Short mmCIF file of C-alpha atoms in Angstrom, two decimals:
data_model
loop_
_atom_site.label_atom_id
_atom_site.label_comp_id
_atom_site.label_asym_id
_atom_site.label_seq_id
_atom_site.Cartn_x
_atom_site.Cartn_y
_atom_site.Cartn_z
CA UNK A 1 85.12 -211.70 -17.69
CA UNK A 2 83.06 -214.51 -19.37
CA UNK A 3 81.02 -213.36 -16.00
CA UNK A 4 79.61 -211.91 -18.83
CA UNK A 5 76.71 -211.18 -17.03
CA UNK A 6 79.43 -208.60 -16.32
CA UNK A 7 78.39 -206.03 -13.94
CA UNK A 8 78.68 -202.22 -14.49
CA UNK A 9 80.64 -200.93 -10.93
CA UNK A 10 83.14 -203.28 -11.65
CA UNK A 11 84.31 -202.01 -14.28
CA UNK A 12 84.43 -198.84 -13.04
CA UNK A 13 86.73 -200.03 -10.01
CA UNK A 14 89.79 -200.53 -12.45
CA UNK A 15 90.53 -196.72 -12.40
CA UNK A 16 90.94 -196.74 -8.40
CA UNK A 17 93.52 -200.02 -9.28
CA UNK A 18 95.01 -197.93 -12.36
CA UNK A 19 96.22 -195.49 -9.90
CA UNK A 20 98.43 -197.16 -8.56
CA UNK A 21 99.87 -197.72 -12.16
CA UNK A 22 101.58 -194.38 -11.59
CA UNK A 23 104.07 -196.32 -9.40
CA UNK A 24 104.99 -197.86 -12.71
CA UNK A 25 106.16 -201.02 -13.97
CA UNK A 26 104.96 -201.04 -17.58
CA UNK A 27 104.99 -204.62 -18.46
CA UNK A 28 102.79 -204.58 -15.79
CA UNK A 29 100.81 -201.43 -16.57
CA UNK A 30 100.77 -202.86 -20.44
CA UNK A 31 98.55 -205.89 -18.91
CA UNK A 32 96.28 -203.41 -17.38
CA UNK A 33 95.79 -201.42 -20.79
CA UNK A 34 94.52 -203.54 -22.82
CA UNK A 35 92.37 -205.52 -19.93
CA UNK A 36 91.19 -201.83 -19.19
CA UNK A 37 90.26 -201.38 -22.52
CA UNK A 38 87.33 -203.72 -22.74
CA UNK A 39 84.93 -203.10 -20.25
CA UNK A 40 83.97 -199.83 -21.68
CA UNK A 41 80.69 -199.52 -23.41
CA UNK A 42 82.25 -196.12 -24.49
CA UNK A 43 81.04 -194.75 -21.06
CA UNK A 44 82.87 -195.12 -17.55
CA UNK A 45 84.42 -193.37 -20.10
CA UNK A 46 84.66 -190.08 -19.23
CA UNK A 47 85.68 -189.84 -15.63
CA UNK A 48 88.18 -191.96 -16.89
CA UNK A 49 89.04 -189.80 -20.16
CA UNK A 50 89.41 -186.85 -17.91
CA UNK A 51 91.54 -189.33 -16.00
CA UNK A 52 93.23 -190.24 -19.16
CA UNK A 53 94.02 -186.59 -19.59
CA UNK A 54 95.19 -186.73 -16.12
CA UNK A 55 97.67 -189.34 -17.04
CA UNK A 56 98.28 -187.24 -19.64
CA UNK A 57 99.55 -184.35 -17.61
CA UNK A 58 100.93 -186.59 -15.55
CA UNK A 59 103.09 -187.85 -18.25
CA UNK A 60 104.67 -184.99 -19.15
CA UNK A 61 105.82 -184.69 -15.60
CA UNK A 62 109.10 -184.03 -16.44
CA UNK A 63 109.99 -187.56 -17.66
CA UNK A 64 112.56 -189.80 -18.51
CA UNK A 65 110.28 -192.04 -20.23
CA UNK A 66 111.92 -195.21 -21.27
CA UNK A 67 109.13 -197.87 -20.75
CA UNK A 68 106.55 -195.48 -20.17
CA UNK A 69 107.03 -194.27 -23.74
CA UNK A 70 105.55 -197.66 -24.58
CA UNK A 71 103.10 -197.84 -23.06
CA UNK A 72 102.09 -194.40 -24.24
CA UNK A 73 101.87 -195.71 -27.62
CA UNK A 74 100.04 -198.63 -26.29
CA UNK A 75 97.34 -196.61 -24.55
CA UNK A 76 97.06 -194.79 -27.65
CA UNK A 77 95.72 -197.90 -29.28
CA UNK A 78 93.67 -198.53 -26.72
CA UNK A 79 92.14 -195.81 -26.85
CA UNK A 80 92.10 -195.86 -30.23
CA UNK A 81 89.65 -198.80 -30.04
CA UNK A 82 87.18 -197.14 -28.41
CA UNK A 83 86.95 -193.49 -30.34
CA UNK A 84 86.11 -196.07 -33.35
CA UNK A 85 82.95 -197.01 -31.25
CA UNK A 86 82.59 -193.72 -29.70
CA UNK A 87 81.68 -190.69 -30.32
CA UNK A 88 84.19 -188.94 -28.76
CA UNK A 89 85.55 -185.08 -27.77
CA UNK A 90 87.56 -182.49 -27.15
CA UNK A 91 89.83 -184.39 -25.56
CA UNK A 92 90.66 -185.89 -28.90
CA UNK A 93 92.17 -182.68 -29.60
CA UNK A 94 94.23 -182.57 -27.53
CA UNK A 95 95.86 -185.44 -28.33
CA UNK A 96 96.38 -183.09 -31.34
CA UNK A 97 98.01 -180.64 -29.68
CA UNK A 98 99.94 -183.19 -27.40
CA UNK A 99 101.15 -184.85 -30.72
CA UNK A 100 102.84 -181.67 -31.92
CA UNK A 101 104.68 -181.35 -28.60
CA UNK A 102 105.98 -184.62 -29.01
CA UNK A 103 109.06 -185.75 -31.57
CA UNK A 104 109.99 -189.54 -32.59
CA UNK A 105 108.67 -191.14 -35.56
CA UNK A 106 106.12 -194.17 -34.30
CA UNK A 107 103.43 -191.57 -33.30
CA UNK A 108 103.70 -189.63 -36.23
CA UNK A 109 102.85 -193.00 -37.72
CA UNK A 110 99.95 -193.32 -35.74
CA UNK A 111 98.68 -189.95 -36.86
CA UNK A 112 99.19 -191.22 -39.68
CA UNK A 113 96.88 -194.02 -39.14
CA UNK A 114 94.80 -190.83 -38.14
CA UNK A 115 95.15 -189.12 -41.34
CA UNK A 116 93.94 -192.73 -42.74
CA UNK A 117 91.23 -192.98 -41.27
CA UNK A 118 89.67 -190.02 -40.32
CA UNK A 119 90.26 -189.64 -43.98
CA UNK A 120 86.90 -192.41 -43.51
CA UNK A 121 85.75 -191.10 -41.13
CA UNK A 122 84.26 -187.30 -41.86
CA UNK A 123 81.63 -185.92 -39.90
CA UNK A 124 84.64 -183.26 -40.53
CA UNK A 125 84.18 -180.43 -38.25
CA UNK A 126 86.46 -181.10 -35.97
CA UNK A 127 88.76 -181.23 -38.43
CA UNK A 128 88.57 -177.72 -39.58
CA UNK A 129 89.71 -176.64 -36.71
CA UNK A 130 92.46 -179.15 -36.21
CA UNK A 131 93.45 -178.49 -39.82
CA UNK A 132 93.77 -175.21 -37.81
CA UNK A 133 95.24 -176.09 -35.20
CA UNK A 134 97.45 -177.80 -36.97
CA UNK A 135 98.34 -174.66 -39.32
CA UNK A 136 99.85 -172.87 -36.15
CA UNK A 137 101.64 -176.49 -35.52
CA UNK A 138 102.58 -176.51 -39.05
CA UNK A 139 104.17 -173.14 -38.84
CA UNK A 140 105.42 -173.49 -35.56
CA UNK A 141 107.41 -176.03 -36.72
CA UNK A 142 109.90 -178.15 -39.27
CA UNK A 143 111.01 -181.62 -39.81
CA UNK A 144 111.18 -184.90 -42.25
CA UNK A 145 108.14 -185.52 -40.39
CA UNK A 146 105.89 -182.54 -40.73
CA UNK A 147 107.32 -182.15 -44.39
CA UNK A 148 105.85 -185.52 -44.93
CA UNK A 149 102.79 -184.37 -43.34
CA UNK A 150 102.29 -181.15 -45.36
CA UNK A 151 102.55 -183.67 -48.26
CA UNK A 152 99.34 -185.54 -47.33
CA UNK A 153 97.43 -182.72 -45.66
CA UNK A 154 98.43 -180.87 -49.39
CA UNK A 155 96.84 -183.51 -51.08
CA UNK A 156 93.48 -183.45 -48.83
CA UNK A 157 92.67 -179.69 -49.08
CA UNK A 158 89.59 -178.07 -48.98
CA UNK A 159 88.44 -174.10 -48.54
CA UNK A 160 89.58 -170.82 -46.92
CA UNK A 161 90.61 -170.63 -50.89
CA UNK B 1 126.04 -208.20 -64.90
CA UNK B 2 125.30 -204.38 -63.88
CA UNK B 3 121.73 -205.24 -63.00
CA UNK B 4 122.58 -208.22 -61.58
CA UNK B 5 125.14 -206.79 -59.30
CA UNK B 6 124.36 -203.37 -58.19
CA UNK B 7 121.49 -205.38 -56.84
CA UNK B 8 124.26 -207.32 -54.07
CA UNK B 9 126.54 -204.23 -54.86
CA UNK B 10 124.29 -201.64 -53.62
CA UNK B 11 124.40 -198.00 -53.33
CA UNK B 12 121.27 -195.40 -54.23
CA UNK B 13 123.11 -193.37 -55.64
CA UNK B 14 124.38 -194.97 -58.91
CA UNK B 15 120.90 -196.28 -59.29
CA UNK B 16 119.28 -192.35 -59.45
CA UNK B 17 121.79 -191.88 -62.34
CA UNK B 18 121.94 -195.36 -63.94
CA UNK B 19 117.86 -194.66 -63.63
CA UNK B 20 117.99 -191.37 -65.10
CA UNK B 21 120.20 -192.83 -68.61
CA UNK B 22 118.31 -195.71 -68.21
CA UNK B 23 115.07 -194.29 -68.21
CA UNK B 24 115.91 -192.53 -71.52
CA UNK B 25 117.06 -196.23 -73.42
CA UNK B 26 114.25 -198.52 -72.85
CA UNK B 27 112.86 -200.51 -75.97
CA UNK B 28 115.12 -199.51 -78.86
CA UNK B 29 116.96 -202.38 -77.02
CA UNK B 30 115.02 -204.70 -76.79
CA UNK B 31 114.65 -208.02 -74.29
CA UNK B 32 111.52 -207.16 -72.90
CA UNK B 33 110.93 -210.02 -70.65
CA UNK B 34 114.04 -209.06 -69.11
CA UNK B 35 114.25 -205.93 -68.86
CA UNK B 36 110.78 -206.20 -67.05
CA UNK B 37 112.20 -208.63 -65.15
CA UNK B 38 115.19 -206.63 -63.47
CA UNK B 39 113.07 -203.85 -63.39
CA UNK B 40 110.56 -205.23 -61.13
CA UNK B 41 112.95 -205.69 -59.03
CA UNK B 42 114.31 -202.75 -59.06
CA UNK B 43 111.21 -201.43 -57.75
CA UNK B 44 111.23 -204.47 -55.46
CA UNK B 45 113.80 -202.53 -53.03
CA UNK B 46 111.66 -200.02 -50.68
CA UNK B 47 112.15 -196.73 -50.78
CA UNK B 48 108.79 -194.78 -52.33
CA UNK B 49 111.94 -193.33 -54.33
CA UNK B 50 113.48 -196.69 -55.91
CA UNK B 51 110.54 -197.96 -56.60
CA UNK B 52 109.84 -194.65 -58.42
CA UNK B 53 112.52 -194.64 -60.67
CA UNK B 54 110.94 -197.79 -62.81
CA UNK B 55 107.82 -195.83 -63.15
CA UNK B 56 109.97 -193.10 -64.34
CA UNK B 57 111.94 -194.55 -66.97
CA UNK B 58 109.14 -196.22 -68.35
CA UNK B 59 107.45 -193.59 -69.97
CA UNK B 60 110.08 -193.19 -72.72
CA UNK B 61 109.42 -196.84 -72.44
CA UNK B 62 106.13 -197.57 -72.54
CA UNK B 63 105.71 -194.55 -74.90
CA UNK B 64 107.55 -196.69 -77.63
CA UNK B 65 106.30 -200.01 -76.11
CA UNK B 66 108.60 -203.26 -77.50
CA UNK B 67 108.21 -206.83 -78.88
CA UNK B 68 104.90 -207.12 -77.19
CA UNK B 69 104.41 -203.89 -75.02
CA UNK B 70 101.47 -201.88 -76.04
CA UNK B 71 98.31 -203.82 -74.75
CA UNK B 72 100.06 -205.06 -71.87
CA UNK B 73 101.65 -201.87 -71.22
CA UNK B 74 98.09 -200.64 -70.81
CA UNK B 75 97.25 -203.87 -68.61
CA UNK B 76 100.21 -203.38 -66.24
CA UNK B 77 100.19 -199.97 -64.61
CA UNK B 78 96.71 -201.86 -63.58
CA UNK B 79 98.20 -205.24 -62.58
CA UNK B 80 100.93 -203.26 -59.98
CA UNK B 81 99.47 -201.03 -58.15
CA UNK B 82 100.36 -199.10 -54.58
CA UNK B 83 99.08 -197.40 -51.69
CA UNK B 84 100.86 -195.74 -48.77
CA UNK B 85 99.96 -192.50 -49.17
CA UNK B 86 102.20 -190.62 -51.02
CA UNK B 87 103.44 -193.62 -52.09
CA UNK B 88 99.79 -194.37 -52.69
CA UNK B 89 99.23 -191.31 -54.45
CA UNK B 90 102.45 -191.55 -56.63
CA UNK B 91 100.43 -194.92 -58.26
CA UNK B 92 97.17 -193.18 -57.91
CA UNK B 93 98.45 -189.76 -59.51
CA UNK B 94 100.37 -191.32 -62.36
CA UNK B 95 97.67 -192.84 -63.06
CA UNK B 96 95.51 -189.97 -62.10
CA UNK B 97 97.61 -188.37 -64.84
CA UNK B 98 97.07 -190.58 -67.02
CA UNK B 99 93.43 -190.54 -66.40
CA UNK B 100 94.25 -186.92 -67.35
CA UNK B 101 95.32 -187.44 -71.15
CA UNK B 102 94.69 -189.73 -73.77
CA UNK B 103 97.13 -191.88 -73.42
CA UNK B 104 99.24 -191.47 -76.85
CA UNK B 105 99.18 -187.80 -76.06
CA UNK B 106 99.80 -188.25 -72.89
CA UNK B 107 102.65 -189.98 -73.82
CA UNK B 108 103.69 -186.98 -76.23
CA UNK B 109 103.59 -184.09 -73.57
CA UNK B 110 105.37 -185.74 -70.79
CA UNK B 111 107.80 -187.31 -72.68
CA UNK B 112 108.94 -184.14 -74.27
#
């Protein structure tokens, strides 16, 4: 990589390798994630978020997760990286939505890390509408978890007095 | 012995209502050092909620202050301090409630 004359295409390639990921083997796929992470200049981005969402589908699947779960949480750091650098898009909301599916703890803790720091971060619009979004998850829902969230999202507040 | 033990003789629940009584007592007896000493520790135990408990108590305590508490009542909320949200907020709004009143009267309210 300290080819760090580091050429554009190649980076690109990785997605054609990641396929293959799908024929798991996390430990593995784990190595890929974080060397995947890197090469993106938040662009190659895209094709690949879209991919990302693809993965996404393809993760619910039907599932039995039990070392793909990891490396969910794994990706979501990786791409958490990159959203810091970015700017980045709808398909951020979904991860939303995607979230409220979802039902163990550790991802409510990165949320969490969410609420923290898009907390800093505010261009807020986004928000709004996730704050929306949210509402219907909110009601269409109950647990330790959201209870906790209400608590936080209480505190923030803001109009629609 | 009771501080001493129920820490290494567990159990929440006795603490909530040991808290409660104790949380009335504070500096008519005295031993400040202490008394600040277990209660630290108290706190020290996670749980947004144990750690609560010491703020709790205090304000009977802190209200009356002891053998050396009023300055150094005011320094301390300062010198212990915590985020983590809502355990963040629970430092941030006690204090934020503190910003609220003038102290001594703040004292008077929420005491009563």
């Amino acid at each position: 990589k300290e080819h760090p004359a580091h050429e554009r295409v190649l980076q690109d390639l990785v997605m054609d390798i990641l396929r293959v990921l799908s024929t798991p083997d996390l430990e593995v796929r784990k190595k890929t994630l974080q060397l995947a992470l890197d090469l993106v200049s938040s662009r190659n981005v895209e094709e690949l978020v879209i991919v990302l969402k693809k993965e996404v589908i393809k993760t619910n699947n039907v599932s039995e997760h039990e070392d793909t779960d990891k490396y969910r949480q794994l990706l979501v750091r990786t791409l958490h990286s990159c959203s810091v650098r970015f700017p980045d898009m709808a398909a951020n909301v979904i991860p939303v939505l995607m979230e409220f599916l979802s039902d163990s703890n550790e991802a409510a803790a990165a949320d969490v890390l969410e609420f923290v720091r898009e907390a800093i971060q505010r261009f807020d619009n986004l928000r709004m509408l996730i704050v929306e979004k949210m509402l219907e998850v909110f009601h269409a829902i109950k647990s330790v978890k959201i209870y906790r969230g209400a608590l936080w999202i209480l505190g923030e507040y803001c109009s629609t007095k | 012995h009771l501080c001493e033990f129920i820490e290494d003789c567990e159990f929440t629940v006795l603490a909530t209502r040991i808290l409660h009584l104790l949380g009335q007592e504070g500096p008519k007896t005295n031993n400040p050092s202490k008394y600040i000493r277990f209660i630290y520790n108290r706190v020290v135990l996670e749980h947004e909620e144990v750690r609560a408990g010491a703020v709790s108590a205090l304000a009977k305590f802190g209200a009356q202050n002891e053998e050396m508490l009023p300055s150094i009542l005011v320094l301390l909320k300062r010198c212990v301090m915590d985020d983590d949200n809502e355990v963040r907020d629970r430092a941030t709004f006690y204090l934020n409630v503190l910003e609220q009143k003038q102290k001594a009267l703040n004292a008077g309210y929420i005491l009563n």
